[PDB]
Amino acid sequence: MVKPEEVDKAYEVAKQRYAEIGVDTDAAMKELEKVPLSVHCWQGDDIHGFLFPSGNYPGIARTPDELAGDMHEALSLIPGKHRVQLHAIYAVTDKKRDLDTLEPEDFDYWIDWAKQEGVGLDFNGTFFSHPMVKDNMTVSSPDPKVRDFWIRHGKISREISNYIGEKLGSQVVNNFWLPDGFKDNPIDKKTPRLRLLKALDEIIKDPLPEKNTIESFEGKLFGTGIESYTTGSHEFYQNYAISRNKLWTIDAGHFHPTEDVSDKFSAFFPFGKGLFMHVSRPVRWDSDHVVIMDDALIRITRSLVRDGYLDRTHIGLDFFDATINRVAAWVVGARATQKSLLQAMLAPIDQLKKDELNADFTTRLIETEELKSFPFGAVWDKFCQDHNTPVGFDWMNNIHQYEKDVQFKRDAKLVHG
Amino acid sequence: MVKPEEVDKAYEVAKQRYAEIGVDTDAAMKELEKVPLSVHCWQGDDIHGFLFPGNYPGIARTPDELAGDMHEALSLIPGKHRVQLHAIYAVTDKKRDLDTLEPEDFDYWIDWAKQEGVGLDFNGTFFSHPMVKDNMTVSSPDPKVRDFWIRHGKISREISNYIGEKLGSQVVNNFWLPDGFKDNPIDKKTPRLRLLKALDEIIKDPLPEKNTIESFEGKLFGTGIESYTTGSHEFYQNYAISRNKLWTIDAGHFHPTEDVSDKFSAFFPFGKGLFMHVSRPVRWDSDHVVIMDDALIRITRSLVRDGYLDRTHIGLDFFDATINRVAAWVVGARATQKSLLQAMLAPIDQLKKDELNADFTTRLIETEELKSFPFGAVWDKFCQDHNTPVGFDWMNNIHQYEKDVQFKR
Amino acid sequence: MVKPEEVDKAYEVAKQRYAEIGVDTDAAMKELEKVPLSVHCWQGDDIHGFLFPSGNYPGIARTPDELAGDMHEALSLIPGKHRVQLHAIYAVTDKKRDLDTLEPEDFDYWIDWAKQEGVGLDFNGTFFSHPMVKDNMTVSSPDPKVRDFWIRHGKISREISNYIGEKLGSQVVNNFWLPDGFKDNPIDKKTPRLRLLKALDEIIKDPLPEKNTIESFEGKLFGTGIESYTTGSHEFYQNYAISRNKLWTIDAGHFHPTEDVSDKFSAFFPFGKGLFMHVSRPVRWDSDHVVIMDDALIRITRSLVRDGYLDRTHIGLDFFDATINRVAAWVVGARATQKSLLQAMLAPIDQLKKDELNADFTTRLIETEELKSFPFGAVWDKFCQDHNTPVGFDWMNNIHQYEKDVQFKR
Amino acid sequence: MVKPEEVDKAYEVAKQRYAEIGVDTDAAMKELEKVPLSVHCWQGDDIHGFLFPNGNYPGIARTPDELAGDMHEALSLIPGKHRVQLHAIYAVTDKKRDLDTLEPEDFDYWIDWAKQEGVGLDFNGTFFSHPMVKDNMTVSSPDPKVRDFWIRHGKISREISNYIGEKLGSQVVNNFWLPDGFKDNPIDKKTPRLRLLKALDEIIKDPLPEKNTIESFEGKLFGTGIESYTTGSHEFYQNYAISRNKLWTIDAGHFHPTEDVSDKFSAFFPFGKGLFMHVSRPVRWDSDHVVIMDDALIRITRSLVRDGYLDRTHIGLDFFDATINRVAAWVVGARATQKSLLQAMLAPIDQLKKDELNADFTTRLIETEELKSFPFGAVWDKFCQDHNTPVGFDWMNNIHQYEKDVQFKRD
Ligand SMILES: [Mn+2]
Ligand SMILES: [Mn+2]
Ligand SMILES: [Mn+2]
Ligand SMILES: [Mn+2]
Ligand SMILES: [Mn+2]
Ligand SMILES: [Mn+2]
Ligand SMILES: [Mn+2]
Ligand SMILES: [Mn+2]
C-alpha cells in the first residue's frame, strides 16, 4: 500500500520540476477534473441487456441491480466525476416491450441510479441482435416494413434521451450506430446511402430541446460478417452531421490500418458542432480491446488538449473484453485515458506552439521526447489520492475483494427482480 | 498486325454473348465515348515546365516538343479527351514568376487545344519554388509567403476563366498544396484555419461557372512532409461541400487498403462534383502509371454502376520517367477506358434487382463470370472504330515515334 | 445456353491472336489440367463435422452422404480432376471417439468415396472447437495434460494420413494449423515458441513413408479473440519447415494489410522443399471470403506459373461463406483460381523474361497490360467445354436444379 | 539547470516504489550499461562520405575531423559506452580509390578515432550512389560485369571489417544492404534471388575469424523508385542468415503497415545465431525519421529484455533527418532507445511471467498499464547524471553552445 505522505512528497518534487519548464501541475489537475468519461454499461453484462434473453471471466452481471453495483464499484476506482452510456436494451420494466414500444419511463431505474451515483447519462439506440435486422440492414433496409420499424425505434431513442436529459438536467448525447452493409462486394453503393439519408432525416424530424438531448452519428469501415461495404461510412456521417447540425462520433477502432483518428478533429471543427470521441483499442481489426496508454490514445488525448477541443468533444469508452475481470476492464481503460489527458495537460503548450510557429523543429522534438520521461506519474498519483481512489497497483486489492465478495459467488446466486 | 475482319468477327460473337445476358455492346461503346480523360501534360517533361529552366531518352524540352508528344499519345487513345496544364507550362518570352503570370501566357495552349480538338483543365503550381517555406505556401504562418501564394491562386482562377471563355468548355482548376509537417505537430488547428481563410480569399472574386470551377485535392502524406498534411481529405471534402466547389480524389493519396471507390456515394448526397485522379500507389504516393488492377476496376465500376460519370471529371496523375513517357500516357489511358468498358458491359439493372432481393449467390457467380466474358473483343472494336491500333499493335507506333522523334532529341 | 459452335469459333480466333504473340493456347490448357485444387470439405457443413454433433443459406449438409453428394455436385461443375481436404472431425464411425482416440479405419468412408469420385485426399488435424483448447492453446499450452492430449492427436493425424496415402496411392499433405496465441499483449514471446518447437518435433518423430504423407505447417498473423500474439507465426513455420524438411502452408488471408503472399515463393524455394498454397479472400481481416479473380489471386497464380513452382506447390481452397449456396461457393472459388492460372499460362513468358533481363520495362508494362484484355475468356470457355462443364453463366442452371432436387428439400 | 541532489533524492524515492513491487533499480541501471548502441556516422554529413566528394539545418560536417567532432559531441550527451557504424564511403585516404579498390588502412583514421573515443566500430558496405548501380541492381544484377564489381566490394568490406576488428579487439558487425529490385511488377522473381544467393556465397567464401567480424544481412519491403519488388526480401535474408550461420538485420522502418518487428525475435532465436536491430521510425513509409519513444520502440526494447535476447542482439541507430540539428538527432534517438530499454528493465518480469503462465491476464493488463506511469524518469535521470550527461531539458544548453562555438561557424 502506497503511503499518502509519500504521494504528497513526490507531487511537490514533480510540481517543482514542471514549474521550472513553465507548467503548473495544480492547474493541470483542475483541467483533468473537467473531463468526464462516458463509461459504457454493456461491458458489464456482455451487451445482453434486459429486454430480450466459454472461457469468459466469472461474475457477469445478469440484472439491473447487479450491473448498477458493478458500475458503482468501477466508478469508485475511477477518480473524478463521470457519465454512463446506456443502450436501449437496458430498459428496466416488467411491461412487455419491443424496441418500437419502449417508453421514457422504462429508464426511470437508470435516472434514479444516476442521480444517487452523481453521473450524467448518454444513450444509444439498439439497432442489432433482433429478428427485424434483415440481411444486416435496419434503418437503410430496402424493405419498407423493416425500415419503418427501425425509424420507430430511432424516434423513440430521441424521446427517451429528451426525457432523461430533462430529469437529470444534463444534455444526453443520443448516439446512432447501425450495422447496415454487405458481407460481399455490392453493385449499388448509392441507393443504400440515399435510403439512410431519408430515414435519418425522418428520425430527427420532430424538434426536441437541445438542452435535453442532441444526436451523434457513428460510422464504421467494416464489421464481422459485413466486411465489404458499410452504408453509414465515416464520410457519410461527417457530411450528415455538418449538414444537419448534429454531432459526429469517432470510434478509434473503426478506421483503416495506420489511420490516426486524432487528425480528424482540426479538419471537422472549422465546419461542425461537436464530436463524440469513442476510445477503443483495435488489434488488427475492430476487436474492441480495453483502452491502454498507447500511441493512438496519447495522440487522441494530446490533440484534444493542445488544440482546445475538450469543451466541444464528449469522450466515451467503447470496448468489450469478457476474458478478464469486467469491472477491472472499465478501470484500466478510464485510468489509461485520464493519465494520457493529464500528460498532454502537463506540457508547456503555449511555448511549444511558439517554437513550432518559428519552425524550431529541433527544440520541438527534444522537448516533446524529454516530457515523456518527466514525472507525470507523481501528478497522476496525486490526482488519484485527492479524489479518494487507490494509487498505482493498490486498486487490485479492491478488485480481489470484489471478486471474493461478489463476482466469484454471483453465478450460484439466484437472479431476481 | 491484327486483321480488322478478325476484330469484327470477335466483336459479333461477343455482341451475341452479351445480348444473351441482356447487355447491349453497341450502347456500352456509346457510353464510353462520353468519358473524356484529362491527360496531364507534366508526364511529358518530368514536371520541368518552361517558367524556371537513368531516365528514358527523348524527354520533351520545349512547348512544341511537349505539344507533339501529347498529340502522339492522344492519336493512340481512342475517342475525344482533354489535357491538364500546370501554371509552370506558361508559354511567353516575358520574365514571369507565379505571382505575375497573365492569362495570355496560355494562348499557346488555347490555340493547340483548338487545333487538337480537346478541352483544357488547369493546376496552380504550389511546389518547387523558393517561396515554399518549411513545406508551406497558402497556409504558411508567414504573411509574406501566404500573400505570394494567394496571388498565385487568384491568378490560377483568372487564367482558368480566360481559357474557359476562349474554348467554350469549363476549365476545372485543381488546387494541390504540399502544406504540412515532416514531424509531429503541436498545433493541428491553426494551420487548417489559416488554410480556410486563404482559400476563401483565393475564391472571393466571382468568375462565371460556365468558364471555370475550382477543385481541391487532399493528401494523407508526402516525402519530407510525412507526419501532418494541412489540406486533409476531410478538410477538403468539408471545404468543397460548404463552398459549393469540386472535391479531388487522387487514388494514390489515401491509407493502405483504403478503397477510394467507397467515397463517391457518401459525397454526392451532399456535394456538387468530383475530380477523380487515377494514379497507382505502390506502398506510398509513388505515382506509378495506372494499370488494370483492383483499385482502377473498383473506381471505374463504382462510377458506372451508380451513374456518377456526368458529375465526375476523370484525370490521369502519375509520373514514370523510367519508360517511354508517351507510352506511359497510353498505358494509363487504355487501362482506365477498358476498365470503364468492362463495368459498362454488365447487366447492371438486373444485378441491382438481384441485390435488392438479397440474392448474393447470383451476384457473386455473375460478377465473377463477367471478369472472363469477352470484354477484350468490345475494347478492340472500340479501338478500331476510333482509328487506333489494336492490342500490342500500338507498340509499332511508339517504336516509330522513338526512331523518328524521341531518340533524335 | 452458350452455343458450343460459338465457343469453338471464339477459341479458334483466340488461338490465332495468342499464336501471333508466340503463345500456344492448346499447350496452356494441357498445363492447366495438370494443376489439381484441394477442395476443402468443411465449406459444405459450416465446419460441423460428424465427431461431435439467421441469414444462413438453406440446404446445409448434415451427414457424410449429404456432404459427399454436395462435393460430387461441385466437382461436376469444376473442369478437370482435383482433390479434397478432410478435417479430423469428418471421421465416419459408429464407435465412441475423441480427437486422441481416432483410428485410420474411421476414414474408410472417405477413401472409398475418393476412389469412386476419382480424386486424391489431403488432411488436417482438428486443433479447435474442443474443451481441451485451454486459453486458446493446444500443442504449445503451458499445461502438460493439454500438450500431451494434442500431441496424441498430432501423431494420430500422421497415422491416418499414412493409411489414406497407402490406400489411395497418392501422397496425403497433412496440414497443421493451431489457434495457439494470446488475445492481449504477452510478457514472454520466447517460451511459447520453444514449447511449440519441442511439441512439433515430438509429433513428427516416428518415421512414415513420404510416398504416403508429408506434413505442412500453417502460420497466422492474428485471429478473432487471439489478436495480439500467434505462437505459430509465418517466420516460425518457414524456419521450422526448412529446418525439419517439411512443407510450409501459405494462407492468402493470414498476412498483414497490403502483404503480397506471391512474394514469398521465390524467397522460400532456394532453401525449402514444398508449399501448400491456401487461396482465401481476406476482407480487412481473416474473413475467409470465397476466392475471386482479384490482384491477390492473379499475383499468386502468375507468380507460381512464371517461376515454374507448380510441381512443388499444392494449391488448396480455404474459405467459409454460409450466406450463399455452399456448393456454388466451391465452384466460384475453384473456377476463379483456374481462370487466373490459365491467364498466367497464356503470356509469352520466355520473351517477357528476356525483355526484363534487357531492362526493357516499357515493353513489359505495355504487354502485361494488353494481355489483361486478350481473349483469355475464349480459352477458359474452351477448357470448360472440353472437360464437360457448363460455360459462363450456364452452371447457374445446375445450381438451381440441385437446389430444387436436393438442397431445398433438406 | 537540474540540481544533482534533487535527482539523487528522486532516485531514492523511485528505488523504494520499485523495491515494493520486487524491482531492483540499481540492477536495472547496471543492465542498461551493458547495451551499447551503434551510432550511424552518416546522419552527421547527409551520407555524403569522403570517397567521392559530391531547406536543411546549418552546420553539416564536410570533413573527417568535423564528423569525428560531431560524433564526439553526440556521444558526450549519451550516457554510458557505445559504438559507431561506418559506411565504406567514409574511407579517409589521399590515394585514388573506387569501391572495388578500397584497402583496410584507408580506415586507420577511424580505428585511431575509435581508440581515442573508447568505442567499437561496426561497418556497412556501400552498394548505392555509384555509376555501377545498373537499373537499381548491384550484387544480383543480370550483368556479370556489374555483379563482379560489387562482389569485389563485398569481399573488401569483410577484409576492412576483419582488419578493424583485429586493431580494436572488438568484433565488427559487417552489415550488407542492397537496393536491388524493380520499380514496377517483375515477370521473374526466382532468378534475381538465385543470382543474389550465388553472389552472397562468393562474397563470404574466403574464411575470416568470427572474433574480428561477422556479416549481417538487411532486407527491405520497398524503397523510393524500387517499390514493386526487392530482391533481398526479409524472408530471403532470415533464411540466408540461418542457412549460412550469419546475423539477420531487422530495420524497424522496412516492414509492412502495422507490422510489429518485435514479434520476429522469438521466431528467429529457436533457429538462428544473432540479430542486428536497426531502430528507425517509419512515418507511413521508410522515411528514416529520428527514433522516438513510441509503441514500436517500446515493443522492440521490452521484447528484447523480457525474453533475454540482448546478448545476441546488436542495437544500431538508422535514420537521417537534416531538417533539425544533426547532432541533436543522434542524442534524441539514443536517449529514446535507452529510456525504453530501462523502462522494460524496471518491470517485475519474473512475477509477470508467472501470472501470465497461470493465465492471470487481468493482473497482467492492470500491472503493465500501471508500470507506464511508475517513476521510470527518476531512474533515467539518475543513469544520465551517474554517467556525466545532462538531465532532461538540460542537454539543449550543450546543443546551443555547440551551434554557437562549432556548427553555426562552419557554413
Ligand atoms: Mn463506438
Ligand atoms: Mn468497435
Ligand atoms: Mn492528383
Ligand atoms: Mn500522387
Ligand atoms: Mn488455410
Ligand atoms: Mn483464414
Ligand atoms: Mn537499417
Ligand atoms: Mn530505412
Author numbering:
A (entry chain D): 1 to 53, 64 to 427
B (entry chain B): 1 to 53, 65 to 420
C (entry chain A): 1 to 53, 64 to 420
D (entry chain C): 1 to 54, 65 to 421
Copied sentences from the primary study:
L-RhI is one of the enzymes involved in L-rhamnose metabolism and catalyzes the reversible isomerization between L-rhamnose and L-rhamnulose. Herein, we report the crystal structures of L. rhamnosus Probio-M9 L-RhI (LrL-RhI) in complexes with L-rhamnose, D-allulose, and D-allose, which show enzyme activity toward L-rhamnose, D-allulose, and D-allose in acidic conditions, though the activity toward D-allose was low. The overall structure of LrL-RhI is similar to the known structures of L-RhIs.
The structural metal (Mn1) is coordinated by Glu228, Asp261, His288, and Asp328, and the catalytic metal (Mn2) is coordinated by His264, Asp296, Asp298, and three water molecules (W4, W5, and W6). The bound metal ions with strong electron density maps were refined as Mn2+ since LrL-RhI was expressed in cells in a medium containing 1 mM MnCl2. A part of the flexible loop region (Asp46-Thr73) was almost missing in the structures of LrL-RhI alone (missing Asn54-Ser64) and complexes with L-rhamnose (missing Pro53-Ser64) and D-allose (missing Asn54-Gly65) due to the weak electron density maps, but the corresponding region in the structure of LrL-RhI/D-allulose (Mol-A and Mol-B) was relatively visible, and a part of the region (Asn54-Gly65) was refined with 50% occupancy.
